[PDB]
Each structure stands twice: as C-alpha cells, then as structure tokens.
Amino acid sequence: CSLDQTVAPGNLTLCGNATLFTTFRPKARFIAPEGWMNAPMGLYQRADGSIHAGYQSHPKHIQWGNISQGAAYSSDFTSWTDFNGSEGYKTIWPSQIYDIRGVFDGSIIKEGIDGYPTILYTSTSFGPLGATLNEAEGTETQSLAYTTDDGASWIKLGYGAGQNPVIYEWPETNLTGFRDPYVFQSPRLEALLANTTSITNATGDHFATISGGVHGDGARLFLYRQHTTGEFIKWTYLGPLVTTGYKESYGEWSGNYGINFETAGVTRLNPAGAAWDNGSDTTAVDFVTFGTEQGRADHQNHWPLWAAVDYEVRDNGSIEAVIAYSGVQDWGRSYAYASFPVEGYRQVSVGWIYEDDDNVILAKQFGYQGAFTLFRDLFVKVVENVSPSTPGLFEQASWSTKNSTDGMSVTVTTLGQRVVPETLAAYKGNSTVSTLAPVMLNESAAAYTPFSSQPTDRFYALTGSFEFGLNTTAKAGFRVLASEEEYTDIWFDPASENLTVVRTASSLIKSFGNDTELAKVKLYEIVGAESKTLNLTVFVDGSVIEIYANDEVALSTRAYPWLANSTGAGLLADGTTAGDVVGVSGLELWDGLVDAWPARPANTSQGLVWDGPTAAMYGLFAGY
C-alpha cells in the first residue's frame, strides 16, 4: 500500500489497520482518541465551570458494540482533555445483567444521588432491539449512576428491587423503542401541572422524557416526572408528550417524523438563549429536539429534527406538546443532537457527524469512525420588518409569522443556532486570518475564483455575505478542499431556496459517498430592501465540512480528497451577468483553527481487535 498523496490513490483496501489514521482526520473538534464513536451523552457543566462531554464509544473497533461512555473535559468547548482511568478514556461500560448489551445514551441530574452529579441512562440487555424488530420489555431499561470525582468514574446503583434499573415497565404496549432518557428541570411544566398533582402524586422538580414509538402507529416521546424532590428511584409516567404519525411529514422544510424517536430533548428558549421562566416571558418558546428513524431514504434513515410546541394540560395530569412549527437541526450527515444548560442562560447543543463510508470499505484503514459537530448555542431567532412579499412566507413551515398592526410588515420567529463564541474566538485567534476584498460576481466571473489568500492544510474557516437581487436566477457559494482534480462545491440557489453540497468531484477515492447534500434556506426579505442576503460560514476540518447559514441552517458533511494539494478554496458563480449580479462582502479566511486535543500525539491508534467467532454466536455486535 502506497501513501503517496502526489499521485492517484491505489487500492487503499490493501493498507493496514490505522495506516490512514491522520489522512482525513479532524483536528479542531471533539473526537474520540481512536475507534468507534457515535452519540454525545452525559453532557453537563461541572461545578468548576468546565464542560464534561461523554460519548457512545467502542475503542479498538470500527463498528458499534459493547457501547460505553467515553469522556473528556474542556474549559471553553474547544480545547479538550481525555479522562484516563482503569479503562482508559471510558468511564461507564457494560458490567451488569441489566446493561451488559450496552450503556446507551443518558443525561445528567446535576444535583442527584447524595448531592452528586448523576446520570440516568438506557441500560440494555439481551433480545431483539430495534424499531423494525419485535422488541420485548426488559431489553431497554433506564438506570442510574453517580460520580464522586467529577466524572473520572461512576458508581451504578445496585441491581434489584427498589434499585437499578429504575424504569423498566413499558408505558404503552408494542413499543418500537424505549431509550435515551433526557432529564431536565422546568418551571414551565411545574406551573402547568401544579393544579393536577393530586391526580398523579408526582411533585418532583425533575422531568424525564424517554424516546420511542408504537409499532405501526408512529413515534412517541414519553414524559415522566420525578415522584418526590430529592429522591431519584421513583419516576411517574404522566403520558405521551409528542405523538406523530407513521412516516408523517410536516413538509419540505421539516424532514419526516419516521417510525420511532431517538435522543429527544426538551428545552425553553428566548432571543438571548435559555429561558427559565414559568410561562411569564412572552418572548420565550418551548422546543423539542429529536432524531427520527426510517422516514428517510438515505443518511442512515435518520432525520435530526426540532419543533416549536405549545403545551396543553390533559385531565389526567399529563402534558400534550402540540407542534406549532417544525424544522431540521442539521440537513447533512449528522444525528443524535444533545442539548444541555450552560451558565449565563445558555442552552448548548452538539451532535454526531458520521463518516461517509457506509459500506465499511476503509474504516479499518482509518482506525476510527465519527466526530462531534461544533457546539452550538440555541436561541429564538427573531427577524423584524420582514416584507410580506417574501415568497412562501405564510406557509409558516419551520417558522412563525406575526403581522404588524397595519399588515405591512411581519415578525418571523424560528430556532436559531450559532457556534459557541468561545470556539469562534479561539479559532480566529489561533488562525492566520486573511480579510479579503469584496467581490462583485457579474458577466466577468469565472465558474471558480480562488481566494487571494489560500489555506495551507485541511483546517480552516470561511465566511461571506452574498447579496442577491430579489428576482435573481444566479447561484453562488464556496468551493473548498480544492485542487484541479478534486473539489467540493457549496452552492446556494435563491430561486429554488436550495443550499447544496455537490460532491461528484470531492475525491478520487470512489468508495466514499458522493451524493449531493441539500438544505432549504428561507431568505426573509426586509421591508424596503432591493436585495436579499445569505450569510454563509464554512468550517473545514480534516474530512468534516460544516456549514452554517444565517445562524439558522446547519449542514454537516464529509469529503475525503486524496491529493495533498486538495486544500484550496474560493468563490463559485453560475449565471451571474451584467444584470444579475451577486455582491460578496465580509469575506474572511481563518487558516489553521485550533489543535483541539493538545495532549494527544498525532496518532492515538492503539490498533484494532476482533471479538472472534463468539461475536456471531451472541449476535449483538459486529465484532470488529
């Protein structure tokens, strides 16, 4: 096997384990030291202000199995340090009959057992497990563990009656799934339920949702309430919080609700960030975020969605979250978004970006799979003075509209997402920053125009504001990871409202995915404006391309160019003329970003192992 990146790639399947470890690997984001990772889990801000991040982990393997919590910490979301204990960077692992099949996703009770941070997680045991299988009660249960050393280790409650698992009875029959407990406090829900606590006897200050669905009848998010404040064993099922139909879609801007929910969370936001009011803040909005499965033909059958909801109290002392509008958290190769509270009235969200090697052709050669997204502040995005002639504005798809008294302008409300400012500041400050001159794209514009300053490697950020005419048919955007022979094109086409990532030339290596990514972006036209603007920011980090538009739309994807010089970037233009012009301004290149794992050497592989012939006998894990 040749690793010569100045010539065409050979047959890379002949290369040894982890021989391509550094070739495509992100350096500026959260990623496991090696091996398989998936969903973020156990996220919390520790007492010292640092962030604890857990993740679903299978060290020394490149497929899922024996799933455990790997963990690390950071003071700024950006520069991280691994925990190191008796199980390396793992801090929770399968060890008991109730969780031996996997320590699945879980979330944090900050003041839990004996006052310590406490995780409620899905403990899995034997049997068919999956939304398309005939799962039985007991295969997925919910269990507790607590930490006396700020996440270096966790102590599980004992197995048995009145101990672990703490939630095991299915709340309804024929579930498609029963996992991913999300624990949260909610002055809002407490106020809504306060007149019904005699019906249920549940008066605790923590709520928990469990994600699932019902066979043949769509997804469900089940709401539990802690029975008594300061006691963590008894959780009382109230009722279904979110109920959607079998492969129901709210429309083109909203993905598809599939057959089963995963990793669902509940939050309340206002324009500044997290809102902890009881309903009295008229600017605050209740949101649910959730993954759905089997409602999508590609992207591992997974949609990471969100919905704004209006809560209604049922007669039996439960809550119906009625969906008001519904959107997409990320349109690309990401899933399993977890959100958590951060000091200063913030709610921060992070997800998992999977690879684009679904046939597992070069996974062993990588020696790892997966990374996180960047950490994102959630908030209510409010756009004032929106023109009523904005096309499709009153579909109110993934946004709400409020007319002015005179009917001449509209206020638009939707979910806002932006990269946490700590990361943007660290990235910019550690990079070589080039502030680029504005560019008018007209009849003289080439299809591709390289920036006047170029990246030096596969670790950079780009930003720009693209000003379009209101009736434009021109397209513009950014080309990244570019040489003559390999490149990835990020286009926005205002006439169709489509942001695309064209990957037909992303790599000479043909086994990686090359399908076109697509997001919908609504340019809310402002009253009196004779143009409409797209603010586009792109992070390039090894193989990750993570795109943000207007602090609203996110699209994560993957590109794996072979050639060492496929690092360039610049502007894309199509159909720009003397009359149909695209003005690009606020252009900036940040070359280098940050080394996110300063204590790690370049190659943190420990090799790969095979579980042997028993893996197929047990039938639980691939074994590699």
Ligand X SMILES: *[C@@H]1O[C@H](CO)[C@@H](O[C@@H]2O[C@H](CO)[C@@H](O[C@@H]3O[C@H](CO[C@H]4O[C@H](CO[C@H]5O[C@H](CO)[C@@H](O)[C@H](O)[C@@H]5O[C@H]5O[C@H](CO)[C@@H](O)[C@H](O)[C@@H]5O)[C@@H](O)[C@H](O[C@H]5O[C@H](CO)[C@@H](O)[C@H](O)[C@@H]5O)[C@@H]4O)[C@@H](O)[C@H](O[C@H]4O[C@H](CO)[C@@H](O)[C@H](O)[C@@H]4O[C@H]4O[C@H](CO)[C@@H](O)[C@H](O)[C@@H]4O[C@H]4O[C@H](CO)[C@@H](O)[C@H](O)[C@@H]4O)[C@@H]3O)[C@H](O)[C@H]2NC(C)=O)[C@H](O)[C@H]1NC(C)=O
Ligand Y SMILES: *[C@@H]1O[C@H](CO)[C@@H](O[C@@H]2O[C@H](CO)[C@@H](O[C@@H]3O[C@H](CO[C@H]4O[C@H](CO)[C@@H](O)[C@H](O[C@H]5O[C@H](CO)[C@@H](O)[C@H](O)[C@@H]5O)[C@@H]4O)[C@@H](O)[C@H](O[C@H]4O[C@H](CO)[C@@H](O)[C@H](O)[C@@H]4O[C@@H]4O[C@H](CO)[C@@H](O)[C@H](O)[C@@H]4O)[C@@H]3O)[C@H](O)[C@H]2NC(C)=O)[C@H](O)[C@H]1NC(C)=O
Ligand Z SMILES: OC[C@H]1O[C@@](CO)(OC[C@@]2(OC[C@@]3(O[C@H]4O[C@H](CO)[C@@H](O)[C@H](O)[C@H]4O)O[C@H](CO)[C@@H](O)[C@@H]3O)O[C@H](CO)[C@@H](O)[C@@H]2O)[C@@H](O)[C@@H]1O
Query: Is 179 marked within a binding site?
Result: yes
CA–CA distances in Å: residue 287 to residues 181, 215, 284, 308, 329: 16, 25, 10, 5, 12
The b/e string for 519-556 (b: 16+ C-beta within 10 A; e otherwise) is bbbbbbbbeeeebbbbebbbbbbbbbbbbbbbbbbbbb
Site for ligand Y in 291-310 (CB under 6 A): none
Stretch touching its own copies by CB under 8 A, among 162-170, 338-346, 365-373, 510-518: 162-170
Query: Omega before 165 cis (within 30°)?
Result: yes
Q: Enumerate the β-bridge partners of residue 573.
A: 476
Looking at 79, 91, 122, 347, which residue binds ligand Z (CB under 6 A)? 122
For ligand Y, the closer CB: 161 or 578: 161
**Options 6, 86, 134, 359; binder of ligand NAG; rule CB under 6 A:** 6
Among 49, 612, 614, 618, binds ligand Y (CB under 6 A): 612
| Strands of the 175-184 sheet, one edge to the other | 175-184, 207-214, 219-226, 235-243
100 binds, among its own copies, ligand Y, ligand Z, none (CB under 5 to 8 A by kind): its own copies
Residue 152 near its own copies by CB under 8 A: no
Alpha helices in 156-206 (DSSP H): 187-193, 197-200
Query: Cβ 38 to its own copies, closest distance in Å?
Result: 19
How near is the Cβ of 239 to ligand Y at its closest, in Å? 21
> Measured between alpha carbons, how far apart are the two ends of the chain, in Å?
22
Region binding ligand Z by CB under 6 A among candidate stretches 14-22, 60-68, 415-423, 555-563: 60-68
Pick what 17 binds: ligand Y, its own copies, ligand NAG, none; C-beta below 5 to 8 Å, kind-dependent: ligand Y
Among 262, 357, 489, 541, binds ligand Z (CB under 6 A): 262
Task: Give the nearer residue to ligand NAG in terms of CB position, either 18 or 51.
Answer: 51
Which residues have CB under 8 Å from 587's CB, separation 6+?
Answer: 435, 436, 437, 438, 439, 451, 462, 463, 464
Is residue 38 marked as binding? yes
94 binds, among ligand X, ligand NAG, ligand Z, none (CB under 5 to 8 A by kind): ligand X
Query: For 139, left (φ over 0), alpha (ψ -120 to 50), or beta?
Result: alpha
Does 318 bind ligand NAG (CB under 6 A)? Our answer is yes
Q: Of these partners, its own copies, ligand Z, ligand NAG, none, which one is at the site of residue 56 (CB under 5 to 8 Å by kind)?
A: ligand Z
Residue 276 CB coordination number (10 Å):
14
Alpha carbon of 517 to those of 340, 572, 584: distances in Å? 28, 17, 23
Q: 34, 99, 293, 489: which one contacts ligand Z (CB under 6 A)?
A: 293
Select the residue interacting with ligand Y from 364, 418, 503, 520 (CB under 6 A).
364
Our finding on whether 263 is near ligand Z (CB under 6 A) is yes
Among ligand Z, ligand NAG, ligand X, none, what does residue 354 contact (CB within 5–8 Å per kind)?
ligand Z
Residue ranges in contact with ligand X by CB under 6 A: 66, 68, 85-87, 90, 93-97, 113-114, 155-156, 158-159
Q: What does the DSSP assignment read for 224-291?
A: EEESSTT--S-EEEEEEEEE--TT----TTS----SEEEEEEEEEEETTEE---SS--TT-EEEEEEE
Q: Look at residue 87 and give the partner it binds from its own copies, ligand X, ligand NAG, none, a contact being a CB closer than 5 to 8 Å depending on partner kind.
A: ligand X
306 marked among binding-site residues: no
Specify the residue, 36 or 235, whose C-beta has the smaller distance to ligand NAG: 235
Position among 20, 39, 120, 386 found at the interface with ligand Z (CB under 6 A): 39
The Cβ of residue 429 has, within 10 Å, a number of other Cβ atoms equal to: 10
| Interface of this chain with ligand Y, residues 571 to 610, rule: CB under 6 A | 607-610
Amino acid at 72: A
Q: 356 a known binding residue? A: no
38 near ligand Z, judged by CB under 6 A: yes
Does residue 94 touch its own copies according to CB under 8 A? yes
- The item of ligand X, ligand Z, ligand NAG, none sharing an interface with residue 300, based on CB under 5 to 8 Å by kind, is ligand Z
Contacts 24+ apart (CB under 8 A), 503-509: 503/557, 503/559, 506/481, 506/559, 506/560, 506/561, 507/559, 507/560, 507/561, 507/562, 508/8, 508/9, 508/561, 508/562, 508/563, 509/9, 509/12, 509/362, 509/560, 509/562
Q: Are 562 and 465 in contact (CB under 8 A)?
A: no
Closest by Cα among 262, 211, 201 to 236: 201
Report d(CA 249, CA 253) in Å as an integer: 9
Name the 3-class secondary structure at 446. Answer: coil
On whether 457 is known to bind a ligand per the annotation, the reply is: no
276 dihedral zone (left: phi>0; alpha: psi -120 to 50; beta): alpha
Bridge partners, 52 (sequence order): 44, 73
Indicate left, alpha or beta for 497 from its phi (over 0: left) and psi (-120 to 50: alpha).
left
Report the partner that residue 263 touches, choosing among ligand Z, ligand NAG, ligand Y, none (CB closer than 5 to 8 A by kind): ligand Z
Site string for its own copies, 59-88 (x = CB under 8 A): -------x----------------------
Judged by CB under 6 A, does residue 316 bind ligand NAG? yes
Q: Are 209 and 241 in contact (CB under 8 A)?
A: yes
Pairing mode, strands 35-45 and 368-369: parallel
614: helix, strand or coil? helix
Is residue 611 involved in binding its own copies (CB under 8 A)?
yes
Contacting residue, 34, 99, 180, 357, with ligand Z by CB under 6 A: 180
Identify what 38 binds: ligand X, ligand NAG, ligand Z, none; CB under 5 to 8 Å per kind: ligand Z
Alpha-carbon gap, residue 509 to 69, rounded angstroms: 33
Say how many CA atoms lie within 13 Å of 621 toward its Cβ: 23
Min separation Cβ 490 and ligand NAG, Å: 14
DSSP letter string, 315-343:
TTS-EEEEEEEEEES-SSSEEEEEEEEET
Query: Would you say 105 is a known binding-site residue?
Result: yes
Which residue's CB comes closest to ligand X?
A: 158
Residues in touch with ligand Z (CB under 6 A): 38-39, 56, 63-64, 67, 104-105, 122, 129-130, 179-180, 262-263, 293, 300-301, 335-336, 354, 358
Which positions make up the binding site?
38, 64, 105, 179-180, 262
Which positions make up the binding site for beta-D-fructose?
38, 64, 105, 179-180, 262
Residues in touch with ligand NAG (CB under 6 A): 6, 76, 78-79, 237, 239-240, 252, 314, 316, 318, 388, 403, 407, 425-426, 429-430, 483-484, 493, 496, 498, 518, 520, 563, 565, 594
Residues in touch with its own copies (CB under 8 A): 66, 94-95, 97-98, 100-101, 125-126, 136-138, 141, 159-163, 165, 168-169, 609-614, 617-618, 620
